[PDB]
Every structure is written in structure tokens, then in C-alpha cells.
Design a protein around this ligand. Sequence first.
Ligand SMILES: Nc1nc2c(ncn2[C@@H]2O[C@H](COP(=O)(O)OP(=O)(O)NP(=O)(O)O)[C@@H](O)[C@H]2O)c(=O)[nH]1
Lengths: 430, 421
Amino acid sequence: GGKDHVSLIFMGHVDAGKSTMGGNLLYLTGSVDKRTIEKYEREAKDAGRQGWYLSWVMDTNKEERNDGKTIEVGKAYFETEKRRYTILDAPGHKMYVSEMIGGASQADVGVLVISARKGEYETGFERGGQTREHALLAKTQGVNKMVVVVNKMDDPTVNWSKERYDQCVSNVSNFLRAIGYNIKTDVVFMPVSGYSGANLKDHVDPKECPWYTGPTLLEYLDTMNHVDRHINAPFMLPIAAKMKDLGTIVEGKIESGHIKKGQSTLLMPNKTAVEIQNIYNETENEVDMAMCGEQVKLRIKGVEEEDISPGFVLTSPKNPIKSVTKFVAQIAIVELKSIIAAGFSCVMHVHTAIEEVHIVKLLHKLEKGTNRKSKKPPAFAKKGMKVIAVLETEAPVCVETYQDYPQLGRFTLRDQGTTIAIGKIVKIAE
Amino acid sequence: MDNEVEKNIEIWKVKKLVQSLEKARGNGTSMISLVIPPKGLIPLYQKMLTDEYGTASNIKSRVNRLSVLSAITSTQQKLKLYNTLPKNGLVLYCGDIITEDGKEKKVTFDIEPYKPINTSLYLCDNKFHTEVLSELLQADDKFGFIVMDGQGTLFGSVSGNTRTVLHKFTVDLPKKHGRGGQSALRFARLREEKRHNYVRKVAEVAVQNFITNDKVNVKGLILAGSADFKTDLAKSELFDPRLACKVISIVDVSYGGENGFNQAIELSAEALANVKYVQEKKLLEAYFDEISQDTGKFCFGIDDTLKALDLGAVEKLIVFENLETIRYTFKDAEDNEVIKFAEPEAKDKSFAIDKATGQEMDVVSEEPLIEWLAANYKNFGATLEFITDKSSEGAQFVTGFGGIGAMLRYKVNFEQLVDES
Ligand SMILES: Nc1nc2c(ncn2[C@@H]2O[C@H](COP(=O)(O)OP(=O)(O)NP(=O)(O)O)[C@@H](O)[C@H]2O)c(=O)[nH]1
């Protein structure tokens, strides 16, 4: 709405019931207060599809979505007894993970969600969830800690026991230190079930409360801070979607700073501007102003449909940026079994954009022309020439140098699905 | 085994001949294609060529009459060398072109191929319609790409080493239940009507594309998307006829964005595309995969080739139809020196010229190395195949090298080199 109202993106494996859980957080904030959705929750709950553990009113909503991809229509949120929360809910094998990173807000805190159990630990120790690439995109700028919720802590055979939770905390906490991040002041955990609740209030008698003394999830988020009176830092707005009516409609979060009705907004990628005809907040709407951390549905007066696409960011003329086509980069490859040959197709992961990329040629290695061996990458000698490459993609993608800012300028590469490399764009070319 | 890719110099070769025949560019209206089917008789054609000569003789307009008599008299002159139509038929190409090297010599091709039946062509127009042997060894359109999504659809085609996308639209189906009152349920009904309108509009534009004139242009047709937006496409009333019948694969993709989409076509092949020329899968990929294994299993273009080919040690050879490498002969004495399609130094390797000795190092000529690899590979116990740069990997070959790469049988080591330490 105005400011202090989070940036949160769920991440987790697709199986993790993360959409059920993110729906239960959206599900009428004020707590219960719901003369229509109490009637919907009266059983409705599912066919075999998302399947059923109580958390639902939302699992049968995947059913009809047609489905297998996505349950929380790249959409939720709520408020608590502190602040408002956006939500944005990673993949059920969707793209809502793209939707965060370069899209809707740089989380002050993400969230990781994991589902400890027999057939879930197996697919959770593969570990290749909508955590993985899906926190790296997520980290081309910022998004971290995330807490971690340990879902599925009632169905399996746990029957409200007091075990497995710590065993998962150890394995998950070596999995967050990987790559090289920060400490553990920012890596608490919360047991949940999606099945029921727990994380918003401790007013359950669950069977965790006989042993668990600590704050709830929201209290371990609320250890950050607030602000006040909107209009604080620079204005930014990522597009989740576009369609048109009288004027174009766009949907998306606001990243920082302010939108009122009847301001100009600039879209740099296109090179156009518009007046916003209206703003919808995110909660109970009555014609009021918004804040980084709610969305806005907006109406757009005097621009075309084509002029904006999802994953772009709007700002004021004041604190803006720029971007171009193919490019040169200094990429650092890890240990992988495969070598990148000159031209090879990887998937890039800048931002919202995951796209196929040809690494056409190899211009220099440590200092030589050769295939991209460099398993542990730079010239070990003076200036770290990991490799210098040229990357080419299907359509011109909005990217800048890392030197102006490290966001748009960093990206990961992965061949199949093992992350071969990371780098920075050095220079722009047509 | 299938020789796939081995086939691809040969396919290519035909193709000049199809363009040069059809084109005959040379101006003048004196080009005769005569194809005579197996078991037809040769003088029924000789007598038609003589009845046309006698008519051609009435034109009496010196240039035009001389073209058509020169054209008929050339095909007639060749037809005499053949006794009968042989088994498999006769093809004959005759006509006066803008020949080069002021050496003249109208085109004269006369041969027996393998099996063009009942085609029986005699035309002297701009084009000979040689067809149905050309239909028979079809090569058409290939694989059909139809992409659902919740945001919008896509139609395209991957055809050999031709991928084409260029025909799409989008939808906002109604996903916004609306807010402000009303109801609950109402949206879900509005949702199922507007999704039915996409099941009509995607399937109809797919009928308006892929099934061209009274038959599907494409051999095969893949439905790709997510979350049963395609299963309600495939088992439907609106889609069916003759297209439901063709569907090879139903591929599940992620965020559906182009990578997912490609991986889609990819997994696909294997038993579909068919022929044995264009598609490769299982074979192409093996070539690339097997080199990956730091099993130095590559020849790829620019350093090791002829030598290894002379010395057994190659499973499958990967060459391109557009190769800018050849063989040259003439240099050094008491023996022979061989030149490869001369690069920045090969073209002017005149340096090898021992002026203070005589060693004449004059950059040979020009021979074609493409055709030789398609006529030898059994003696070496190896193989040979061909491809194109029509793609990411393709463009690597040109920049990294020229157009010739090999696939050592089993794990051999990257050929040592000075640069290597
Ligand atoms: N026992 C148990 N099962 C759960 C829980 N949450 C989800 N599941 C199961 O896991 C399946 C997948 O959950 P889901 O949240 O849709 O995964 P997702 O892929 O992250 N969702 P999305 O891709 O839409 O974000 C569901 O069909 C459900 O049966 C939970 O807390 N406990």
C-alpha cells in the first residue's frame, strides 16, 4: 500500500506444496473473516492432481488451472499484525521464479520450502527444486535468507512427532552455505504444515509447541525494520503481465518509491512513457496510493500494448538505466564434467529472462585460444581471465555492463541443468 | 545400418542438377528435358523428337529456329548412344546455356539413375516438370510445431536443418475473476468458456496452416505446452480430422519460453521425421556427445582430417556440403605435395618456392573435398556423413574452423600440439 510491506518470494521444489502454503498465507489476512471462502473450504478438495493434505482451498484451484505447472496463479499475498506482505510463488515447474528476480521485488527476504518425507526426501535430495537455479536467478541482484519452512511435517508418518526436523536443518543449512553467500544470523527455520497453518500466529496447540519455545516465522521476518509515509527511495515497477481495455492494463509489483494516479512513468526498454489513469492497490481498494511492496494493477493512458512486455521495469525520468543485444563477458566456469566448446548452447539466467544462448567462439581463455577447460576458472596469474566470451541469444535482450551496476550485468550459465558458469558482461555490441 | 548424413553429399549433388536443369538460366527457349520411364520405348521418343524437328523447321526465324533445332538435334544425338531404355529409365538434359570460358558446349547430360516410373517428360519451356520421382523422394515440411500456453500460442515447423517460427497470436482468456462484488462461481464459468474459445482459435489456425491443400504438408505434428491445454486439444471435436491422426508426440514444457520449446522438438525425433537424411537425432547427437567425453573423439573442422582418414581411426566423419576445403596436387620433386583449399597462406603458399633451388611453390589449382569423402571410407574401415551450420553449433564450425570434423571410434586422446603443454 504506502511503505513497510515486504518483498517475499517463495522458492522450493515443485512437489513441496509451496502453492498450497502460499495460498494459505494469502487466504483472508484479518484471520478467518470470510463469508464466501469459508463456504468454499467446506470440503472442495481435490481430485488426484495436486492431491490433498487440509492446506488447500487452493489445491483444487490448481486442478482447474489446467494445472501441473502452476497452482498459485503467479498470484498472492496478505498482511499480519505488523505489515503487508506481497507474495510471489515459485514454480510448480512454472516461471514465477523468473517473476521474482528481475521482475517483482528483490526480496528483503525470499522463502525456502522443503517437504521432508520418504518419496519427498528422494526428490528433495536430488535437491534440484525451484530453490536452486531458482535462487541464483533470484540472486543476480539480491533476495536472501528466506527463513526456511519445513512443510509436510504432519502427513508422511510424523503424526505430530519431534524428529526429522533437525536432520533436515543440517542438510538444508549446508545447501544454503554453498556457492558462497553470508553467515547464519540470516538462516533460521520454521516447521510448518501447509496442512493446517502455523507461521502467522502461534495460537495453535499443534504438538510442536510442547518443545518449540521460539518466535513464529513472521516474528523472525519482523526482526528487520519498517519505514513510514511513502515516497522514500527511487521509484521502480516490474511488469508481471500486460493486457488492454480502454487503456493498457499492467500488473506488477513496485520495487521502491511511489506511484500516484496522474504521474508520468517511463519504460526505458521501449523508450516510451505514459500517464497512469488509475492505480489499484492490492487489498481493499478505494482510489488510494501505493508503495514498494504492494502491487499495483495500473491503467496506462497514452502508450501501445506492444510497447511494454513482462520482465521490464518502469521508473521516473530520475534514477534510470540502459541495455543492448549480443555481448562480451568474462565468465568463470566451475568444476563440470562437460566443457563449453566455442558456440555451445547454454541456458542463460540473467533475470526474469531464462533464454537459450550460443556462446559463439572462445576469444581468450587464461590468455590463449582453446576450448573452455578452466575447471576452477581464471588465469591463476595476475588479471583473472576465467574466459572472455561473446554470448548471442534469439531476440535482443535488455542487458547492461556489471560496471554500472552488478544486477543486470551478472548471470549464470547451465548446460543441461548443472550450473557451468557465472560471469559479468564487459561490453555491449550490436 | 542407415547411412544418414553419408547420404548428404549425394542429395546435395542432385540438387545442382535440379536447379541448373530447371533454371537452365542461359536465356533462349531451347532447353529439353527428356525423361523416359522404365519399359517405355526409345524411338517413340525418337519419333516424337523427329516430328518436333520437322515442325521446328517450319519456324524459319533464324535465331529461334536455330535454338530449337540445336536443342532437338542435341537430345536426338545422345538418344542414339542408348539402345533401349535400360532398367531404371533414362534421364536426358539438353540445351543451350550462357556457357563460360568462351569454350561453349551446350549442357549434355544423359544417364541411368534408379527407378523413375511413368513420369515420361518432354518439355522445352522454362522448366521441366520432372516431378513425382521428385515427389517420391519427397522431403517435405517435416515436423509440425503447435504450442499452447495460458498467455498465447505458437505454430512453426522444424524441417531438416530448416526451423521456422513465424505465425502466432495471444490470448487473454478471462483470468481476472473480477473484483468488486458479484460472485464467486461466475468466474469459473467465464473461465471455461474463454478457454474453449482458445481450443477453437488455436486448433483452427493449426488447420489453416499445417493441413494445406487436401492433406497435411508436414509428416508429423507435435503438441507442446503444459497442464492439459494440449490433451483437451488432441482429444477434441474441433481439432480432429487427419491431424489428430498425425500427432507423434505430446511434450510437457515449463515456463514454455523458447528453451523448453526446443528441448520439446528435440526429445521428439527418434522414429519420426523419417527419411534417413534430414533429422538425424540419435546419430547427430552421438557424434557430439561422444567427443564431449574428454575422450578426444573429435575431429571438428580445422586441424586433423586427411591424415587420420588415411590412417584408420574414425567411426563417423562429419563434413559439410558447403566445404571450402579441397585437395591440390603438384609440389616438391622426387615425390608429391598435397594442398588443402587454400587458406590465407595456402592460397599464396608461394613461399615454399625455393628460388635459390627451383622448388616452385605455386598454389596449385582447385579440385572439390566433399566428393572424395563420399567415395572412400571402406578401405579405412571408417565412415563419413554430412551436415550444415544452420544453427548455433553450426556457426561454431565456420568460426572455429572451416567445415570438416570426424568422430574417432573409441576414446583416443586430443592430438598433441605445440600450444598444448
Ligand atoms: N504432506 C504434504 N504434502 C504437501 C504439502 N504441500 C504440498 N504437498 C503436496 O505436494 C504437491 C505439490 O505441491 P505444490 O505446492 O503444488 O508444488 P509447487 O510445484 O511448488 N507449486 P507451484 O509450482 O505452483 O509453486 C501437492 O499436490 C500436494 O499434494 C504439505 O505441506 N504436506
